Design a protein around this ligand. Sequence first.
Ligand SMILES: CCCCCCCCCCCCCCCCCC
Ligand SMILES: CCCCCCCCCCCCCCCCCC
Ligand SMILES: CCCCCCCCCCCC
Ligand SMILES: CCCCCCCCCCCC
Ligand SMILES: CCCCCCCCCCCC
Ligand SMILES: CCCCCCCCCCCC
Ligand SMILES: CCCCCCCCCCCC
Ligand SMILES: CCCCCCCCCCCC
Ligand SMILES: CCCCCCCCCCCC
Ligand SMILES: CCCCCCCCCCCC
Ligand SMILES: CCCCCCCCCC
Ligand SMILES: CCCCCCCCCC
Ligand SMILES: CCCCCC
Ligand SMILES: CCCCCC
Ligand SMILES: [Ca+2]
Ligand SMILES: [Ca+2]
Ligand SMILES: [Ca+2]
Ligand SMILES: [Ca+2]
Lengths: 591, 591
Amino acid sequence: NHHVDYVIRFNYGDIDTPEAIKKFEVLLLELSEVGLQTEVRQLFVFVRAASKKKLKRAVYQSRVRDWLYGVRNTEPEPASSAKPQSEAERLLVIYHLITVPKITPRHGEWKNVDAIFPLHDEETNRQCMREWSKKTFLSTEDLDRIRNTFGEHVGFYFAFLQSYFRFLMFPAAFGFSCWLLLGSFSIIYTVVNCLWCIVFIEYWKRQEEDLSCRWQTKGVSAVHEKRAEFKPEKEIVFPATKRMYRQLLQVPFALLAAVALGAIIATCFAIEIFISEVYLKGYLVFIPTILVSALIPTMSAVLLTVATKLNDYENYETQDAYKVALTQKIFVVNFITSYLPIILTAFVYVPFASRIVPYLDVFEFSINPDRLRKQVIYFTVTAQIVGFALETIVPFVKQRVFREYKEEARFLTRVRNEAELEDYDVTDDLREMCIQFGYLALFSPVWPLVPVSFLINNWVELRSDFFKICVECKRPWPQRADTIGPWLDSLGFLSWVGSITSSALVYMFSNGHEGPTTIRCWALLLTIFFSEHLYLIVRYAVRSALAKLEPPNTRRERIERFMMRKRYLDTFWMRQRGWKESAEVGLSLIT
Amino acid sequence: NHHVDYVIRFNYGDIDTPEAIKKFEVLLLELSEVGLQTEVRQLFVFVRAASKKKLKRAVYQSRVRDWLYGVRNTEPEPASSAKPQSEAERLLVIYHLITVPKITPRHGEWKNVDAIFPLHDEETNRQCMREWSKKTFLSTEDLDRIRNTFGEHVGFYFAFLQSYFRFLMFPAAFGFSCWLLLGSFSIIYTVVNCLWCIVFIEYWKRQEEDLSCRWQTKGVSAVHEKRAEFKPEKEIVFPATKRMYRQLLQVPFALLAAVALGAIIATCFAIEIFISEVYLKGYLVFIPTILVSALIPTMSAVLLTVATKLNDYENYETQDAYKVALTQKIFVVNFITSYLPIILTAFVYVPFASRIVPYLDVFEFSINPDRLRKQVIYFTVTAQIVGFALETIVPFVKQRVFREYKEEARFLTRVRNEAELEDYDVTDDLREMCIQFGYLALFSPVWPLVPVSFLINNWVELRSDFFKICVECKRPWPQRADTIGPWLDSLGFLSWVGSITSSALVYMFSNGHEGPTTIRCWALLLTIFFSEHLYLIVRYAVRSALAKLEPPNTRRERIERFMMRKRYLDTFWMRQRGWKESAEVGLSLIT
Ligand SMILES: CCCCCCCCCCCCCCCCCC
Ligand SMILES: CCCCCCCCCCCCCCCCCC
Ligand SMILES: CCCCCCCCCCCC
Ligand SMILES: CCCCCCCCCCCC
Ligand SMILES: CCCCCCCCCCCC
Ligand SMILES: CCCCCCCCCCCC
Ligand SMILES: CCCCCCCCCCCC
Ligand SMILES: CCCCCCCCCCCC
Ligand SMILES: CCCCCCCCCCCC
Ligand SMILES: CCCCCCCCCCCC
Ligand SMILES: CCCCCCCCCC
Ligand SMILES: CCCCCCCCCC
Ligand SMILES: CCCCCC
Ligand SMILES: CCCCCC
Ligand SMILES: [Ca+2]
Ligand SMILES: [Ca+2]
Ligand SMILES: [Ca+2]
Ligand SMILES: [Ca+2]
């Protein structure tokens, strides 16, 4: 309540006598530029809009600026009827009316300010957290409500997850038939799956071209806020050619992550085989479990600081390209810590365990035949439950218990209890969706009921993720995007390898595993070359098909830019006696 | 001379008494719409511009129309200083001032008119046919001269061929070292070749984005002339969804062309092996040569009429998409009649001739070891000479001899001698360049001196193709394009397979051919999977590198559309006493 748009908190780090001076500078610069800077702090500084006229100029100066960079594409309405018409759109102007240069508190670094965040609208969360908890799919008018608050970068998540949930009803039905009627490893199911994983990619690439155009946000790559942490050396900047000689260093980082995380997973996989040989039994089972659940959360956390100390080398003048180039350096960790402990089961054991059974240095064997099937149960069913309680229930209990040991203006506690909470990142929430797409592409022929396990998940995960933004963490400031970003390029790579891994897995499991038995000459490498090249000419056929059907929300963009230019537009021997005698020459010619 | 812009000829087919009437209609419709329709025919009708004012309106009505469809992107200059400033640009308005509906003679069909064509400017051909016959590369000011006449669709050919000639100096030097120092089949040369074939593709895709922007023609896909041969069923048209159920029939056509042309090439290859067995000797050599040089020119000519009777099924409302969709149906013939007689040598003989020697039904054998090397000489060296004389010298003699047996206004013969000539097609001229790129990608490790054979060719072929447009065939009317078209998509496919075919050819020629000897299990299919997947992550690295460096002619497009929109733009508990008292609250808080 109380018409607050943002708060601005303070750290109290050092000696107060320059901090008296710095408090003026973070307050003089506001009141010279925005209005009604107020504090009933303790320290956090409230901020309002200035007037019902100085705000209306700032909305018009923003609707002009994205127009002439080629986003809005209509004409900007003037300051007479310049109502913001959206709660997220008004909060977006104010944050650009604070964060931008030429105004900055520079909220992360180079000053002494902790965070800037808006306040929740509790009465419209409570009437939606219970509203679409009953429906099985929420409508386009419901998704625009998640756009008119929380910005659009949060809005592309819940529309992706909705469109992911809507297409999962086809493999969940068809995989149910292949489980109940067929057995596993069926040659029909692994073909329909890879044909399914093409259409969902090529539908969503067409779907973003509607939804980033219907929300008037197609082309925001031109309009990105700059990073303060940027070191140019010229003026009207940094040469992009010097990036390529320094982004080339990213490839020795990817070799390092595959060789450091590759060892720790292969070590802890080798030890838990060794209890099947030698073994006290029940005590020693959790010895590889302790080591793998403590080292790769630590070793990956080392590789974040290596990636961060690498990513701040290359300058990346825009804020978006910094977050994208960091995320593409983390997916090589996320590919290798989540798919390697099941590649190493399916492609090492059942090929050969007789070669690696006589090596007894970590102090008769038939293969336990369901080591693979039990392990693909563990992520897609079990870890979807213990991962549900760990991101929603357990941090909700941690924040509730923490307030209980602590215990005209009562909401100054409520703002203070909101200021303690965490801060949402959609990139942290897209990686749990992009990776679990991998198990549906890479390892679905083992136990074909895995799309049923994600169908039940993604209905609940759609609600629990809207739960955690409203009551568990603070409100994200409204951020704009024209796509989900790096993941769409990586959701297509992850279905590439799913065509190689599946069709190689179907051939060996032709009614016998037997870990030197299966032919590889005309069989294994041939069905990889043939299946994967049949993958490519199908996605070439689907992508070239959907590019010929433009959807209506982007057809109304091309027509509307036509009408804009329509309105700015609106602001010597010859003697044959014309044609009546020239035709008389032709009538004379008859032979 | 004589200020003629186009001529319009006539057929004299049927009985003259409605042809008296039809002569009025093709002349009344001109003089109501254009000026100075004149004939000193025999029949062909001259046509001029109307005035120095009615022409200037038509140039302005064309510069407006491509602007508001988003091509010209500046503002159109008004009719005061609306000089056409180009010879091809003035002839382009007149042809659209004749051919377009709502005016049509519809020059191909549904009336009785044969052809419309402009006249050559002989004095500026003669001063350029000898001018750049001395230089080794012609400049950007020389290429604009081939743009300001002959349109732009001819202009993208001579700029592609120039940029192809400029990058061929690197394999011609490096392949000369690999021939003189190394032998054939060297593992270094086949890697640098496939790395070369990526950069030339990814440079030219970046180069068209300059050259179709510097010529003010980026986005002409919006502005295409319609086809008269078009059968809609609605109004404000034909559903594009019905195309996909009928373009699906293109794939059984491609199976038919590979099985009809596949037989005749495999038959005539089998017979010329059979003279190496049984054999009179010298008479019987040319028996497969006669059959293969007479059936595949006939059998392909059948497949044009099948493709044409297929392509007119799907409507293709634009003129460009008809020519593109025909050309993509002919490349499956051109792939299979030009590369199959050397795939079938390299991948059948030296794998196994002992299996196919005992089959003697077409009435000891060591393999003639240079059947492959002598055959790859034949296209890349010999057929480049007998193909030179067959497209330039021999049709020049055919047109010169034909006039000699025949033998105030002398040029009415010159126009009549120009009207007899052939008509140029750039698509017929790009296919001889796109296919000979295939031999440089697909079969370069045999006899590595093949880029020297195309370097000498492409200097001569650049001049002889400019020779044949000026004196051998009539002038093409100025046609616009923003790319070379279908070939750029097919010049990348043709380097895909060149990474598979080369790296498989290096493995079976590791110092022994021996047509069951080479391992294929861990060797042949493995070096295809690894080499080709290393091809893909290199072209992903090159394409993502060049997309980060925008060239200046398209940077001056994005800035210039910014300045266009710049000019159309130019046509309640609160009491804390501002900030000077709000800061006084923070100074009190010290502990
Ligand atoms: C279950 C082990 C038996 C392995 C031997 C059978 C392999 C010989 C038959 C090849 C089957 C694959 C044919 C090539 C792939 C075609 C898919 C496009
Ligand atoms: C010349 C005939 C000899 C064939 C046997 C040699 C094959 C065994 C060594 C494999 C060489 C290729 C290694 C895999 C390709 C790596 C290229 C990325
Ligand atoms: C607009 C949503 C279209 C629904 C199509 C769902 C069909 C799922 C199967 C996809 C083809 C394999
Ligand atoms: C761990 C991967 C290397 C193991 C090699 C196993 C060799 C066993 C003999 C099979 C011969 C191909
Ligand atoms: C579309 C790519 C997946 C096709 C899978 C086919 C696998 C064929 C294996 C047959 C072995 C008997
Ligand atoms: C980038 C477009 C790739 C898909 C089009 C090429 C199809 C490649 C098939 C190659 C099979 C040998
Ligand atoms: C503008 C033309 C650049 C010339 C570059 C030619 C270099 C040829 C070798 C290409 C790299 C393999
Ligand atoms: C023409 C292609 C089929 C020829 C098959 C040759 C078989 C020879 C014996 C080799 C066994 C793989
Ligand atoms: C870049 C793709 C071409 C690479 C060719 C490598 C071929 C390796 C063959 C080695 C066999 C001894
Ligand atoms: C269309 C983009 C294709 C290139 C990017 C994907 C790279 C594929 C490499 C897959 C290796 C297994
Ligand atoms: C080991 C996997 C390394 C590559 C991860 C995917 C990065 C490419 C995305 C297109
Ligand atoms: C036998 C070759 C058939 C395919 C020819 C290439 C058509 C695809 C172009 C991308
Ligand atoms: C047989 C090759 C087909 C390729 C189509 C893109
Ligand atoms: C090892 C896979 C690398 C893929 C890079 C696109
Ligand atoms: Ca989850
Ligand atoms: Ca979550
Ligand atoms: Ca030629
Ligand atoms: Ca030619």
